[PDB]
Subunit: 116 residues, 4 copies
């Protein structure tokens, strides 16, 4: 699993289940191409979004639907969403893990770049 997304709820202190995460990849036209899509499992992580061969070089946008997650719980959050825009595989084949900590009025995101 080259690309991975890990999401947590800071209010309840557990994994953020069913959070719609959308992965786009840039284009020469500078428009966004829909690379992948999925929702986070009961563990709060969405692995198996892409494969080594398919995850080529480029700029990717990982967009997390935080507003929908909260609205479901009955809370109206600040952000409409939270996205992580980065340049992947520039140097070489690296395995990424994107983690995000959620709160109504704050969100935190860290990455963990690792060799295969």
């Amino acid at each position: 699993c080259p690309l991975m997304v890990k999401v947590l709820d800071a209010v309840r202190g557990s994994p953020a289940i069913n959070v719609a995460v959308h992965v786009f990849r840039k284009a020469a036209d500078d428009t966004w191409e829909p690379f992948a899509s999925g929702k986070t499992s009961e563990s709060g992580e969405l692995h198996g979004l892409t494969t080594e061969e398919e995850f080529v070089e480029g700029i990717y946008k990982v967009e997390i639907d935080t507003k929908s997650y909260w609205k479901a719980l009955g809370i109206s959050p600040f952000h409409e969403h939270a996205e992580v825009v980065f340049t992947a595989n520039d140097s070489g084949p690296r395995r990424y893990t994107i983690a995000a900590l959620l709160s109504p009025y704050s969100y935190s995101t860290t990455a963990v770049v690792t060799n295969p």
Copy 2:
């Protein structure tokens, strides 16, 4: 000042200076349309973006150019940029303070929403 962005460097433990900040107010045709622009002062705070008269009930995008701040220092950051997207003033004249803590492979943004 109903909208002020605050940015702090978490590696050197000081305010992030000269960080480019771009604000975009969503237009009626659903296109991100330029609202404000500026660079964080020496205190890390960027003020004087707009006024309440022209800070209408919409969806704004405060984009902080973190990539260039870090590259200037000689470091190579993970994120292309940090982006906060939210629906402002959808009730009444609220004052919005949006702050962000920066780290090369991590960052988090909080929002303090008050009113005079």
Copy 3:
């Protein structure tokens, strides 16, 4: 001024009002002895803890009573309290600014040291 302390609430998106704060400097006996106390204001801070003359070089510890804060709102937080142990005025006189973003199960604390 030398020991400034802001405390935010990442759930309600506002400053944390009346959050107890206890500071302790390390005594020559390696035990923790009292130094200053007070509660955060409406703006979410306490600016009158000590003054240069009393804020000598040593090992300090700002303890923030997070437990009691979250217990009033009805919530049952994970931590008993947020602590920040650090060495003060090592490089001569400096002005410190501790800060914590509070959330039920997760807290974050940044430190900003500026020179007079």
Copy 4:
């Protein structure tokens, strides 16, 4: 195991390897009595800190040595160390992952209590 720990370097975007970890347990006579200890693995995880029998109801403190981690890298951190004081196993038997994101002048910790 029932008590797992995680440290993550956010300056380099990698797991924090060889970080000292010391767990304490609230004694009966209100003093910090040693409970368990170890060092983080290649993945940044520290497992087998305690059995599913020693971890009885009490007030545990997890001290993560931040100071030496940064010193070794040439960096001059702000904090002497990260601490996580919490109450465990009062609602019954629980699993506790305790994460920490590090930066020279800022650290963040989150708890993920899972139910067996």
